[PDB]
């Protein structure tokens, strides 16, 4: 996460760390939607070009973590993947069309001050919230800067960063990149005229894009960190996996598959 700020304690109870058993490592971001279900971007799991193709065996999920690096004894909860669920229409091979993965946890995770699930947006939460101008909250433990030779300083965040980015208009999203955009995705970030900073970055993907509803006081997951071109680039925007458009796959699985 670029041009963000360190998160606050329990500022994001649903954040999930996709930790690589070995090499010991951060795979992506993820989000707690249940005591047992975890949302992630599909591509954190499967990306042929980087040759990504993790078996559930290979990962652990770390929920309730503030520190990136520390292993937080008594606040964080490290989980085992029971079963991974990838979007069937996920197109890595292109523009990452339907960048969504689900994981079922062998066992139920314990709610704490630090552990709690977010909401999934309803057709009406979405209609009203997912509007150009409206600000989302991007959380993760990814890059603080676009990968650069010339960049000096430590690129990894000690603590989880938080950045607030407004929803952009398709057209604008569309006119920004030569990539085929789709309805399965969205863009968030400061328009040029706005002269402001902050984006997610390499390692943030998998991570929630949440909006708070005036409507009833809850936090809803709007987008999954997907992709982009550069991080915090002038004229560029971040691309989110539009959760709602993709919700019925989500519910279908959770349903015949578990809780």
């Amino acid at each position: 996460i670029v041009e963000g700020s360190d998160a606050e304690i329990g500022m994001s109870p649903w954040q999930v760390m996709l930790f690589r058993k070995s090499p010991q490592e951060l795979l992506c971001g993820a989000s707690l939607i249940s005591d047992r279900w975890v949302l992630t971007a599909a591509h954190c799991l499967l990306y042929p070009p980087w040759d990504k193709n993790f078996t559930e065996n290979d990962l652990l999920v770390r929920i309730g973590k503030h520190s990136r690096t520390r292993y937080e004894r008594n606040i964080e909860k490290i989980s085992m993947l029971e079963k991974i669920y990838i979007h069937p229409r996920y197109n890595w091979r292109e523009n990452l069309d339907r960048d969504i993965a689900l994981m079922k946890l062998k066992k139920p995770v314990a709610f704490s001050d630090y552990i709690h699930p977010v909401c999934l947006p309803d057709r009406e939460t979405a209609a009203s919230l997912l509007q150009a101008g409206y600000k989302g909250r991007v959380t993760g433990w990814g890059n603080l800067k676009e990968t650069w030779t010339a960049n000096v300083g430590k690129g990894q965040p000690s603590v989880l960063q938080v950045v607030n980015l407004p929803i952009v208009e398709r057209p604008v999203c569309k006119d920004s990149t030569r990539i085929r955009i789709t309805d399965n995705m969205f863009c968030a970030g400061y328009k040029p005229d706005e002269g402001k900073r902050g984006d997610a970055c390499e390692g943030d993907s998998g991570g929630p894009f949440v909006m708070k509803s005036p409507f009833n006081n809850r936090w809803y997951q709007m987008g999954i960190v997907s992709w982009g071109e550069g991080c915090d680039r002038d004229g560029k925007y971040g691309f989110y996996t539009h959760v709602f458009r993709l919700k019925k796959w989500i519910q279908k699985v959770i349903d015949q598959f578990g809780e």
Partner: peptide
């Protein structure tokens, strides 16, 4: 980089 975790998760 990453503090070791209980080799029980591992």
């Amino acid at each position: 980089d990453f503090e070791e975790i209980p080799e029980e998760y591992l």
